[PDB]
Design a protein around this ligand. Structure first.
Ligand SMILES: Cc1cc2nc3c(=O)[nH]c(=O)nc-3n(C[C@H](O)[C@H](O)[C@H](O)COP(=O)(O)OP(=O)(O)OC[C@H]3O[C@@H](n4cnc5c(N)ncnc54)[C@H](O)[C@@H]3O)c2cc1C
Ligand SMILES: Cc1cc2nc3c(=O)[nH]c(=O)nc-3n(C[C@H](O)[C@H](O)[C@H](O)COP(=O)(O)OP(=O)(O)OC[C@H]3O[C@@H](n4cnc5c(N)ncnc54)[C@H](O)[C@@H]3O)c2cc1C
Ligand SMILES: [Cl-]
Lengths: 525, 525
């Protein structure tokens, strides 16, 4: 049965589609069931269908975005803006609110507007992928490098707008975002920062501009459709070296984290984002689950030991990258070896010392940590048939006992649903993330429903222990925002007031981050 | 004549005052003419009286702040929140809107709530000064250091809330701010970030939390009264060394800036915030104008040469600090000397080589750059009798030709209004600030009016050249916000919509950053 926007008749929707076609062109509006299939969540959560788009509209310009927004206000049609729509693990391109129209800005708004070599920045449209930007930098013999997530096919802009992250020293994307242009919910256009000062050359140089600083309000947000965004770019160092440290025991996590923090907090000797990945995560990158175990339930201890031995990895595997002149790299690596070498059974390998199957993750991290985009990690999804994942990422203090508590409680819950504990821990400077990926058969309704029910429990149990998530899937946005309820839900009430003021017709991505406009509030959508 | 809130009778104001006394106590509400004199702008701008407070209220707790806000809503009383009220150069404690009540949060809300050594942060109430925090750190044998502005008597919180800055690697205060608690304009209380997740230990560890990131909306803002704020604190390095480079010629600025940028953008070898100060600024720090010139009009070339020779300084004076093990300091200093030494006439001095009168600024920067608070810079105000200053700080690209343009155009206008050109240039990573302090006799109505009219022209001329200011004085807030008018004033319209939604009764600091609530908009206040 045809997916329609809430409250919009078939006939009114057909009329609205024609209005959208008049703006963007006939071939740039998709609305048949088969056309829309590719815009459904590739990794669906829950057995029942959810997050169904009614159409996709691909504008070519900011003006076209403004016109689309105006039409949507006239008809009361919700709009879900994306850049490349590769938010896989958190819903893909699919809207939180079923019946919403996807506004795929990146399809045609895909220009690199400027890369400035001297000051080190890019000004981008949403369709510029990490692969696209890398190709530009390489072909122009740039001295700059980008910072990419694990998969290079996403958007420099879209990733930033969900507060996505990478692993170089510029890994905090939002931090390095500098200036944006946004179409607000009734169709008006605004530039932030020094972009608001006509003729300023400092849009990509100074983020704040004058007065209240608004750019963060457009991240994980439903307050507009971003059409341009700037980001700072780091100079490529003269040399780099990546390394792996394998740690043999599950319980080593406590000591690893307690050493990681002091080596990272001053940004040296751990100069990049430290990542600690468990054996399940590293095995999934290079092998299928059935290589190790084809039975029912959690993987047994004997099979875990076989993964470690066959791949020459530990239960916990630390990956890092060093940058600078060779003598600096040598000094930092010496410090790292001295510190982590206090853990019995730790073994060290550089990216030059591992050409085996087990070393494939090290080789991938060496690319990612050097701003070389990759799709190697798509192999994770071959862990089981029809593989998909959902991301579950609580934030906590960088403390070894806190890490052990999280490890144990998530693994306990995963075991109940016969899901592997595939996880790592990362630190920024002062904060810790528990990066959990649950991989499952997307073709199995039971597995889809298990994932939904399990992750709802994980969210609750984490919150009960004082951990909240930094980012989440469509299916969990209400649940996660409900955990941030200090002062009787004060934060959400604040967001709601702002949403209603900027979006009185309730058009833009209703329900993103649990923030619903008045007309949808309290309706179990 | 008694200063009253706009539209509020003597009798209604008296009733509101009594309600405030019922909340905070009789001695914590000030409302006599004599009491209020001390809360006037110490460095008034314009001949006519302006920015007059009607009262000062000193709450002891968040709950008291909430009750004050509720009372202000009921009686229509505008509230200007401050921490320590030392925003000298930009209005002091005085409200933009005459007749507003100052809410001096810092008088009694002055506790250090937490200093965490391991993760490196503080959680603070508004009344904690830089001197207060330094005394705490020293007395507890901390391994942390703070980042202070030039004068240590301000508030760690209040400074951050105006996007104030210091000069260590943690010089961007707002960047390192992590979590806040705020009373919104109708009296509800909210915590940002992980503070919104009850029981989280990560309020001061991870700034963003979940969903749209709002903390920037409370800086240079009138959207609430902040009651608590967290900030990250850097670990103190094992050693440090400060240095001065004197450059003899006015025209050397171009080359200095063009060398500064590449030495700073990678955060090495220039590890701290680079500052370049002119001879007027450095002379004023150590001497009176009449030492050099007692005549009418701009200082002649012969007197400028005498300042340089007697103080053994250049026209432009570069100050920097290096941190780390002695070998690292030596290497970086070598790189800096090699690079800047290409400018003919450059001379180098370390903080160990130069404890003469001219070197007093070097010794002060060595304190500031090491998180040691100081009030030595108050000596600037002795340049002339009854000395005050106004801050004028345009932002531009870190380009030598741009610097020369700004130098010349600001100096031209200063000369025309008989004001000394006291200025420096600083760079962040990618952006440049032209830090102008105009010192004048605050007791002279003509001088006050000249300052106002000159700075209005400077704001306009800067905007015409594509430069906007990062921060400004009460008297210039409307003018500066008017320059950020891309898209027919889109930015201000956005701010106004948010202001009216959160503050329907138009209570909090009307006119801050040029943002007026509906009831005051378009009224020439
Ligand atoms: C195995 C695996 C590994 C992963 N590793 C990482 C990783 O290392 N780091 C990481 O960050 N992610 C990671 N992800 C998640 C995901 O792949 C990336 O974050 C990806 O870059 C996001 O998709 P995108 O860039 O296409 O953004 P989009 O899907 O285009 O945008 C994401 C969201 O941002 C908002 N948005 C985007 N564009 C606009 C706009 N123009 N206007 C307004 N709002 C907009 C919307 O809410 C949208 O849903 C991983 C996923 C998988 C499956
Ligand atoms: C010679 C000289 C040198 C200076 N050098 C520097 C320098 O190096 N760096 C720099 O940043 N400044 C500098 N200043 C400016 C000024 O001294 C400082 O920034 C000072 O720290 C600001 O005053 P404060 O900390 O008392 O903040 P306050 O005056 O208390 O607050 C400043 C503003 O922030 C807001 N605010 C404060 N508290 C709250 C609250 N609780 N809730 C809501 N809003 C609030 C208000 O708008 C308020 O007016 C200099 C000034 C002079 C005269
Ligand atoms: Cl409120």
């Amino acid at each position: 049965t045809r997916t329609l926007p809430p409250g919009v008749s078939d006939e009114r929707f057909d009329a609205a589609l024609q209005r959208f076609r008049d703006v963007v062109g006939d071939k740039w509006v998709l609305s048949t069931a088969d056309e829309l299939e590719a815009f459904r969540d590739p990794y669906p959560v829950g057995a029942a269908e959810a997050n169904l788009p009614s159409a996709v509209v691909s504008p070519e310009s900011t003006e076209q975005v403004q016109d689309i927004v105006r039409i949507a206000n006239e008809y009361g049609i919700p709009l879900h803006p994306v850049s490349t729509g590769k938010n896989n693990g958190y819903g893909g391109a699919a809207p939180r609110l079923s019946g919403s129209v996807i506004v795929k800005t990146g399809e045609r708004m895909n220009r690199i507007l400027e890369v400035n070599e001297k000051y080190g920045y890019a000004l981008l449209e949403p369709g510029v992928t990490y692969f696209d930007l890398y190709e530009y930098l390489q072909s122009h013999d740039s001295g700059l490098m980008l910072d990419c997530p694990d998969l290079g096919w996403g958007s420099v802009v879209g990733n930033t707008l969900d507060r996505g992250v990478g692993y170089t020293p510029y890994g905090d994307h939002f931090m390095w975002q500098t200036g944006l242009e946004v179409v607000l919910p009734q169709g008006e256009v605004m530039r932030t920062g020094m972009g608001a000062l006509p003729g300023s050359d400092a849009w990509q140089l100074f983020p704040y501009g004058f007065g209240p600083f608004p750019d963060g309000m457009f991240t994980q947000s439903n307050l507009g459709i971003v059409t341009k965004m700037g980001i700072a770019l780091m100079q490529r160092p003269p040399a780099s070296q990546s390394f792996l440290i394998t740690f043999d025991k599950e319980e080593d996590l406590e000591q690893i984290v307690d050493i990681m923090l002091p080596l990272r907090i001053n940004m040296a000797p751990l100069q990049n984002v430290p990542v600690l990945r468990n054996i399940f995560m590293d095995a999934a990158a290079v092998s299928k689950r059935t290589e190790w175990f084809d039975g029912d339930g959690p993987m047994p201890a004997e099979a875990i030991e076989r993964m470690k031995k066959d791949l020459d990895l530990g239960f916990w595997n630390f990956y890092g990258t060093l940058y600078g002149p060779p003598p600096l790299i040598e000094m930092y690596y010496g410090m790292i070896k001295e510190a982590f070498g206090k853990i019995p059974g730790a073994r060290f390998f550089t990216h030059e010392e591992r050409d085996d199957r087990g070393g494939h993750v090290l080789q991938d991290r060496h690319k990612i940590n050097n701003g070389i985009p990759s799709l190697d990690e798509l192999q994770l999804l071959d862990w089981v048939p029809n593989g998909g994942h959902i991301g579950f990422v609580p934030v906590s203090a960088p403390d070894g006992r806190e890490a052990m508590k999280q490890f144990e409680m998530v693994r306990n819950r995963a075991n109940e649903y016969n899901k592997d504990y595939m996880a790592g821990f990362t630190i920024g400077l002062r904060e810790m993330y528990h990066v959990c990926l649950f991989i499952y058969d997307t073709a199995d309704p039971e597995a889809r429903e298990e994932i939904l029910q399990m992750t709802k429990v994980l969210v609750r149990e984490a919150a009960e222990a004082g951990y909240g998530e930094y980012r989440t899937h469509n299916a969990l946005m209400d649940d996660v925002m409900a955990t941030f309820n200090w002062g009787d839900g004060a934060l959400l009430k604040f967001h709601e007031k702002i949403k209603d003021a900027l979006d009185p017709n309730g058009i833009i991505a209703p329900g993103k981050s649990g923030i619903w406009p008045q007309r949808f509030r309290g309706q179990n959508l």
